Structure formats: C-alpha cells, structure tokens
Design a binder for this molecule. Structure first.
Ligand SMILES: [Rh+]
Ligand SMILES: [Rh+]
Ligand SMILES: [Rh+]
Ligand SMILES: [Rh+]
Lengths: 122, 122, 122, 122
C-alpha cells in the first residue's frame, strides 16, 4: 500500500497530513494542525504494515507528532493509531492520544483521546 | 532529556524498549513484546519534545511499532503516547492504542487501549 | 436537557439506544447492539449533567451496559462517555471502552476503544 | 461477585469509591474525587456481569459519575470501564474517559483518558 498511503491527507478538522510510505514500513512526513497550540508544519514519523493481509482488511499503521517546531512548543505529543482503507474513497481511520507534559500531581489529567478520519480530498 | 531517554527500558509485562533520542526530537530503536502475536525485535520510530518546560513537568513523547518483522506479521500497529519523568527512579508513563487491520464490518472491534509504565530496571 | 435526551437513539452501526433522562441526573434504559456477541436488549444505567452551561457547550453524560441478559452473556461491559448536542440535528457524540473479563495474563488485551455517534433518526 | 464488589474502594489518587452491587447486575453508590473540579460525594450508577465465567477471568463492570452535586458542577462526566479481580488482594482495574461539555469548535479537546486501580485498602 506504499502508493496508496503516500501523499497528502486531510482530516475532519481541516488538518493536513503529508506522508511518505517507505518500502521498509516507514512513515515520514509533516503534520499541520488546524486547531490547538500549533502552527505550520511539525515533523512526523511512524510505521505501517508493508505486507498486509489480502482478505479485504485494512492496513494497520501509526505515527507520532511532538508539538515542537521552529515557531512553537506546546510541550505535548500526539500519536495516531489506525488503518488505511483503499478503494474508491480511500480513508485512514484513526484514534489518537495527545499527552501533555505535566507534573506528577497533574498526570491524571495528561492525556486527551479522540478520533480523526483522513481522506484524500478536503 | 536526550541522555535521560536514550537507553533500554522495560515495562510491567516484561517487554523491552530500546530507544535512541536524537537532538532533533527523533526517537528511533526497537521493541520486543513479551506478549501477543510477536517475537524478537520490531522497528520503532517516534518523537519527543527536545525543549521541555523547566517547571517539574514531564517530557512529552510518543512512538509507533508496526508488528511486522522478518519472523512474523500480526497485521497491527501500536502507538504509545506519554511522558518521560526523570529523577531518582526515571519512568516513561504511557497509554497505548493497538489497531489491527480489519474489514469495514469489523472495524468497531479494531482498537485495543491500555497503559504501560517503563523503568530503567527490570 | 431532560426532554432532549429522553427517547430512542441509533448509532452508525445500527445499534438502538433507548434512554430516559431523569430530573435528578439519572440515565436509565436499554441498549440493543447490532454487532458483537449480543442479541436483544440489555439494561443500561448512567448519569448526565442536569444543569449544563448556557454558552453553547454540549451536555456531558455517560452510561454502562454489562453484556448479560436473559439470552446471552458475553462477560464484558461497555461504557460510553460523551456529550449531547441539541438543536436542529441533535447528536450524542461518544467514545467508548469495552472491557472483557480476562485472566491476569491476558489483561493487557482486555479493553477495546472506539467511538459512536447517536442521532434521533436512522 | 456481589459480596466482593460491594463496599468501599480507593484508587491511587486517594479517591473514594463506595458501591453496592445488586443481584440484578446493578452498581449504585457514591464517588469522591481527590483531584479536579470536585468536592464531596457524587452519585454513581453502573452495571457488572452478575454471572461471570469460572475460569479465573475477572468480572467486567463499569460505572458513570456526572460531576454535579449540591456543591459544585464541573459540566463533565467520567465513565470507568474495567474488571474486578477477587482473591487475596482484590482489585478493580479500570480505564476511564472524562468528557467535558464543550462547544463544537472545541469538541476535539473534550475527552481525557486515564486509568485507575482500586483496592480495598488505602
Ligand atoms: Rh468516525
Ligand atoms: Rh499506572
Ligand atoms: Rh466521528
Ligand atoms: Rh496500572
């Protein structure tokens, strides 16, 4: 699914996910969030299953963004975990965990969870 | 926290997380799971905040493993999202999302969630 | 939002959520899942904020179903946590955690996570 | 596990979970959080598997607290999903989702996730 995954994706928030899928299972690229303490692109890296089943199942993958770049630092990191579904209207359906650096006393409050769906159009 | 993070970590399941933290915010290394459809090491990649706050807060980070290697393929990927806490007994406290590739009809059933704590000893 | 919440809702899977919102903040009713090890209705109980903000924010709520009834027992329980959004096309947007009873050795594998959106029509 | 579950539990934060397990699978009681926008007891309700497997597996359960009482309203609700494990040192191991009522524009930011372990002593 190297061809399928590689390219520019957009989620329901208007965020922009630009990713290259390597033959070796690597995901590399940049993320631009439309919301939160973020601006411009952030480096991302991740992994996908480069030899998925051939039974109609999606392709498992994930990636991470640490929310620091040359412009801003939000002292947090999000990971997206999901699968790529090919075909007519390709999608990457994910759930994500956003952890902010906290003191021990506030750690119970450290992690947001949500879900993003990415498509090739937006 | 480049020095702090880099090295060998172990979680409560006996899994082994071997990671190098780069000056540029990169996480690279290998993961060996003690449970599940897995054996030997898998490539991981991720990101950490390379300029965290100086107020006692932890350092945000995350990484991804796609569960394919030269031995096995589980058609799944886990992402860990959490923070590194330095000091006397350093810890990386995470929550994780494990997504398996599924058909659309089974997608509701695609994602496990849990939490792992990593320490420098085990 | 007692009036708004009370009634029959349906999610994207075709499941049926029948709920009564009490003046005291109680949620009571029945759930019928369209997927998984389930058939017919299961008792649910839960809670909602009976005095929400008046600033356009949604109404926080949650409920639990244990997957045992007179027909089947799946030895599991799901909790939905989310908010009710009123207006033209009312919605209850949730994320859920489905925990299966496991042995200690399999506990890492005990919990599924996902998201369901409920509307008054389907 | 009616006998096992019923009683007073405490988590790692010092919160107090007081619960009665009914023969019909009901959970009823009160929760007192040691952290966050909360004070004194809040009503809880939930469900547990009243006929669990007899193979060493834990007992699935869940409950909800809406964070409104006679003293405070935080416009939020937490659901705990997990399992009760009996024996020498009984535990209820959970993961939780805390949803705050938000505007649509802030909904991506609505839900915290974490994990609490409850024991009979603290
Ligand atoms: Rh969705
Ligand atoms: Rh923990
Ligand atoms: Rh959605
Ligand atoms: Rh734990």
């Amino acid at each position: 699914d190297e061809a399928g995954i590689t390219g520019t994706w957009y989620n329901q928030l208007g965020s922009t996910f630009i990713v290259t899928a390597g033959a070796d299972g690597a995901l590399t690229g940049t993320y631009e969030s439309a919301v939160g303490n973020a601006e411009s692109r952030y480096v991302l890296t991740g992994r996908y299953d480069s030899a998925p089943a051939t039974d109609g199942s999606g392709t498992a993958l994930g990636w991470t963004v640490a929310w620091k770049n040359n412009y801003r630092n939000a002292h947090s990191a999000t990971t997206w975990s999901g699968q790529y579904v090919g075909g007519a209207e390709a999608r990457i359906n994910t759930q994500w965990l956003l952890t902010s650096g906290t003191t021990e006393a506030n750690a119970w409050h450290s992690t947001l969870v949500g879900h993003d769906t990415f498509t090739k159009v937006k």
